[PDB]
Design a protein around this ligand. Structure first.
Ligand SMILES: [Mg+2]
Ligand SMILES: [Mg+2]
Ligand SMILES: [Mg+2]
Ligand SMILES: [Mg+2]
Ligand SMILES: [Mg+2]
Ligand SMILES: [Mg+2]
Ligand SMILES: [Mg+2]
Ligand SMILES: [Mg+2]
Ligand SMILES: [Mg+2]
Ligand SMILES: [Mg+2]
Ligand SMILES: [Mg+2]
Ligand SMILES: [Mg+2]
Ligand SMILES: [Mg+2]
Ligand SMILES: [Mg+2]
Ligand SMILES: [Mg+2]
Ligand SMILES: [Mg+2]
Ligand SMILES: [Mg+2]
Ligand SMILES: [Mg+2]
Ligand SMILES: [Mg+2]
Ligand SMILES: [Mg+2]
Ligand SMILES: [Mg+2]
Ligand SMILES: [Mg+2]
Ligand SMILES: [Mg+2]
Ligand SMILES: [Zn+2]
Lengths: 151, 129, 81, 144, 153, 25, 93
RNA sequence: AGGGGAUCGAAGAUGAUCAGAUACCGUCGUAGUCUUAACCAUAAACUAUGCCGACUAGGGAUCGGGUGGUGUUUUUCUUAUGACCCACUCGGCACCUUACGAGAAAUCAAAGUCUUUGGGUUCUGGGGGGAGUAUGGUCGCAAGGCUGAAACUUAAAGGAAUUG
RNA sequence: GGAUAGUGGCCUACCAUGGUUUCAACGGGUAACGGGGAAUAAGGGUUCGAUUCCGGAGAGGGAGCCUGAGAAACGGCUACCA
């Protein structure tokens, strides 16, 4: 219930069940599930979108419990993992959108404050990803490589 | 954030003993906390405690007996030579008749008397009496 | 309440408590076998479904998402999983 | 709690923190800056010799009504002029003009004491012989 | 780096002679010595062509005394390294520790490959320069995180 | 005085001192 | 924040004038320009064209063929090499 | 600096009281008050309570969200809403009673879990003045801000409550 | 390469642009010689250590040097400054 740059203390989260195996009611087999994952990834969706879709329209509670592996690992093994981790991509999209909004109208200071907060988040996450070497160690983000990446 | 899980545990047990409860729920569980509990149980300051698995982090339900008056963690796990342990047991434990400085040696997590008998010494974990 | 059995408390109490706070964490949502008015196809849908789940054969809005538990269509019929 | 760092590897911050807060004590600041040497009338010294320039009756503080007979003395060690008290009844007449007088501290850590304003130091010896011996007629001044 | 006596004077190992009249011409006889303390000479030293009179293997300097392990922090100087040694100094007034570091400049033979971030075992030797008192003996994590650079199953 | 007024009087004295310093330099 | 750019341009002009005659005060000018660049990089807006121009002028002054002036020459060569680590020289060309 | 220019209004102009009144009150009244770029970075910027954690005691309410109600009306014949009623839950401003703990208390459900003294952490203070002064740096166009002494002097200054 | 008894930017010729630092370099002060220890004393510390032992340095201030195994000596020299 801690927040990164706010005074909130929210408790909103996902509450994964105790069971480590497939539910007694699941009839589909894991191979069909992973094929579905790969076809959706080919469609061009992020792993979070894959998880939400497979939770809603199908009986996949979570892809790990039935396929034995995590969605990002599935895409990576079949070579569909994006060069940028998806959450960091969403951060960059938010940051470039805020940059554009600040460019259009200048006096708005609250967007500037939220922009510097976003830049802090991006710096932290990118530093972590560099540490795990997901990104190349040269990877650095200042102004315009953002507009290159988001497009 | 939650830095020392054992500090949380011992704070909970002390607060509930002062309040007058007979059982506590230590929310995050860890091996070191389990060993602390085994020591206190062997010496009798605790009744019958139970572990619960959650696939994320264990929970512990400790049945007290009111015999315990105060535990406590020495949060910076200081280094104590075999000589300074007497200074520590003079500083923390009320009287030399009873009270135990629970500390971790290479031989395991164990009180100060057993540690003296094995002639080993390590880092201090806490004090129970 | 100086003495109570935290290990096996009364079922109504745990069902009353908020999730993520019971003795063991277990979600309250569930899945549903829903039948569309159009065909005899049976589809599995999450309780708090976030997207407008539709039948694969025909485009029909089985569920309309909302803040919490998803809202089923009037014609569709649901069964607890 | 106790908002000072407490981890094992925080010796540096605690040490610098104590070194920095030690500047609050007046005694420590005096010792380190050497105020007892640079600016004090005595060079961190208990006694020093001097020459009487003239004699003054300083009026006491509020509740005390009297005149405390002091003498202005130019110190021979550095030349700073300073007033100094003379104890006991018949002692000012025992202090010759332009006479070798030895001064000591006045008993309050270099601060003015009692009802005497602005005077900070006693008189223990005059012209070699001490003042107490003269007051009790143990000895006679060398009148040199 | 294929320097091979590019400098003004010739770079010869002193008092090792090759007889041109000897009609073998099997390269040039190279002097090397095992340094002791259970340290194995690298094949780059034996099969190499550098000179490095200050090499602990193929030179004149000898290794005795201390054996220090550290991490390179600067390779940028020529034939020599700046190693950063970290340690915990104990302050008894508080029963605590400070993380302190010392910079030791050592000499690296061309027989080894050193890059910033490597962990290296070095040994004491005679005064080589004003600040160089050590010759590298072993480089462990030369490409510990650098072996894997691309990813495709 | 009020501490407010003491500060204001000191500020005016500082202003006069700076004027004198600028004249001297 | 135009004062920093104006001062950098004045420093570049002074460096060009000193090189016209050369490192007696050019070393101090380059040293102060380094601090100006550090201060500009401290804020969000940095790396102006004046800094690149001053760096190129210092490189030209050090390159020319040329007594404390020798310390100035060595220090200016080292400073030009260090500030030439930037790729902005490609922009200058 | 540029655009505004109603009210209000430091300075001022005055009309009265007053022993004096360039003060309180009454009329006017420039700068500002409102704006556009650039500065300034200070307030009793106060909850005079640093932040992040865990625990400890009951009570309703209130705001937002989510749950269930064979719930109440609604009305579009009725579902579905919405608005309400009941119960619970998460998070927030608070509030009420109480101490079993705390404090020197006034009081606090955090200022508790602190001699039975240790969850992680930054920043401050060491008697009152002298004084946030001198000096030196640095920022600022300026006003001033940040940093920041000492000599000397003093036996108290001060907090909370009690009776007069 | 020179020089040394010898290692060594110790020095020279040429070349490279490096070395240290917020884990406090560098600079300023020390009424600072360092250490063995002294006073103080619940435990923790605080201050002091010119001074009987061990090292370091100096013989007015600096410099240079003969001699001999050992000196940049000083109750040995040469020179300047006071
Ligand atoms: Mg841990
Ligand atoms: Mg009188
Ligand atoms: Mg105007
Ligand atoms: Mg007026
Ligand atoms: Mg008037
Ligand atoms: Mg008006
Ligand atoms: Mg303030
Ligand atoms: Mg405040
Ligand atoms: Mg605050
Ligand atoms: Mg004071
Ligand atoms: Mg003041
Ligand atoms: Mg100033
Ligand atoms: Mg007050
Ligand atoms: Mg009062
Ligand atoms: Mg040589
Ligand atoms: Mg000392
Ligand atoms: Mg000594
Ligand atoms: Mg000598
Ligand atoms: Mg003499
Ligand atoms: Mg002889
Ligand atoms: Mg001599
Ligand atoms: Mg002699
Ligand atoms: Mg002679
Ligand atoms: Zn359908």
């Amino acid at each position: 219930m801690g927040r990164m740059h706010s005074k909130g203390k929210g408790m909103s989260s996902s509450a994964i069940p105790y069971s480590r195996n497939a539910p007694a009611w699941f009839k589909g087999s894991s191979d069909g599930v992973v094929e579905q994952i790969i076809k959706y990834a080919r469609k061009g969706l992020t792993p979070s979108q894959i998880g939400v879709l497979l939770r809603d329209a199908h009986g996949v509670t979570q892809a790990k419990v039935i396929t034995g592996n995590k969605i990002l690992r599935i895409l990576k093994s079949n070579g569909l993992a994006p060069e940028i981790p998806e959450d960091l991509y969403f951060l960059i999209k938010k940051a470039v959108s805020v940059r554009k909004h600040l460019e259009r109208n200048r006096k708005d200071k609250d967007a500037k404050f939220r922009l510097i907060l976003i830049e802090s988040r991006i710096h932290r996450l990118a530093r972590y990803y560099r540490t795990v070497s997901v990104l190349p160690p040269n990877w650095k983000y200042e102004s315009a490589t953002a507009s290159a990446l988001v497009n | 954030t939650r830095t020392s899980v054992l500090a949380d545990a011992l704070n909970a047990i002390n607060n509930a003993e002062k309040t007058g409860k007979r059982q506590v729920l230590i929310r995050p569980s860890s091996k070191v906390i389990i060993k602390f509990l085994q020591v206190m149980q062997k010496h009798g300051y605790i009744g019958e405690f139970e572990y619960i698995d959650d696939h994320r982090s264990g929970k512990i339900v400790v049945q007290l007996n009111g015999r315990l008056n105060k535990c406590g963690v020495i949060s910076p796990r200081f280094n104590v030579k075999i000589a300074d342990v007497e200074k520590w047991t003079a500083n923390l434990l009320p009287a030399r008749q009873f009270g135990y400085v629970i500390l971790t040696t290479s031989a395991g997590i164990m009180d100060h008397e057993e540690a003296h008998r094995k002639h080993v010494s390590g880092k201090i974990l806490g004090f129970v009496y | 309440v100086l003495v109570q059995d935290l290990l096996h408390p009364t079922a109504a109490s745990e069902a009353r408590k908020h999730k993520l706070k019971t003795l063991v964490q277990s979600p309250r949502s569930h899945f549903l076998d829903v039948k569309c008015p159009g065909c005899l196809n049976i589809t599995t849908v999450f309780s708090h479904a976030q997207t407008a789940v539709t039948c694969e054969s025909c485009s029909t809005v089985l569920c309309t998402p909302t803040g919490g538990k998803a809202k089923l269509s009037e014609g569709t019929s649901f069964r607890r999983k | 709690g106790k908002g000072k760092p407490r981890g094992l590897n925080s010796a540096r911050k605690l040490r610098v923190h104590r070194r920095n807060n030690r500047w609050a004590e007046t005694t420590y600041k005096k010792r380190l800056l050497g105020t007892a040497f640079k600016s004090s009338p005595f060079g961190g010294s208990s006694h020093a010799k001097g020459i009487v320039l003239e004699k003054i009756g300083i009026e006491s503080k509020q509740p005390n009504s009297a005149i405390r007979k002091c003498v202005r003395v130019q110190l021979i060690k550095n030349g700073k002029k300073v007033t100094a008290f003379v104890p006991n009844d018949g002692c000012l007449n025992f202090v010759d003009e332009n006479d070798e007088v030895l001064l000591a501290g006045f008993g309050r850590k270099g601060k003015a004491k009692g009802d005497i304003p602005g005077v900070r130091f006693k008189v223990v010896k005059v012209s070699g012989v001490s003042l107490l011996a003269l007051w009790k007629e143990k000895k006679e001044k060398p009148r040199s | 780096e294929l320097t091979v006596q590019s400098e003004r004077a010739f770079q010869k190992q002193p008092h090792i002679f090759t007889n041109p009249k000897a009609k073998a011409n099997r390269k040039t006889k190279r002097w090397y010595k095992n340094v002791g303390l259970g340290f194995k000479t690298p094949k780059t030293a034996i099969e190499g062509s550098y000179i490095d009179k200050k090499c602990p293997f193929t030179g004149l300097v000898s290794i005795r005394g201390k054996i220090l392990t550290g991490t390179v922090v600067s390779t940028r100087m020529h034939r020599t390294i700046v190693i950063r040694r970290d340690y915990l100094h104990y302050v008894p007034k508080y029963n605590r520790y400070e993380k302190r570091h010392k910079n030791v400049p050592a000499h690296v033979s061309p027989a080894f490959r050193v890059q910033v971030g490597d962990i290296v075992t070095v040994g004491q030797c005679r005064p080589i320069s004003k600040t160089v008192r050590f010759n590298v003996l072993k480089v462990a994590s030369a490409t510990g995180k650098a072996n894997k650079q691309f990813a495709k199953f | 005085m009020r501490a407010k007024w003491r500060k204001k009087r000191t500020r005016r004295l500082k202003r006069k001192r700076r004027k004198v310093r600028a004249r001297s330099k | 924040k135009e004062k920093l750019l104006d001062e950098m341009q004045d420093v570049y002009n002074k460096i060009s004038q000193a090189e016209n005659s050369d490192w007696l005060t050019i070393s101090n000018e380059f040293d102060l320009i380094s601090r100006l660049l550090v201060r500009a990089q401290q804020q969000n807006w940095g790396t102006p064209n004046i800094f690149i121009k001053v760096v190129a002028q210092v490189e030209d002054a050090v390159n020319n063929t040329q007594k404390a002036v020798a310390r100035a020459y060595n220090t200016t060569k080292q400073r030009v090499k260090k500030v030439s680590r930037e790729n902005e020289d490609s922009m200058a060309k």
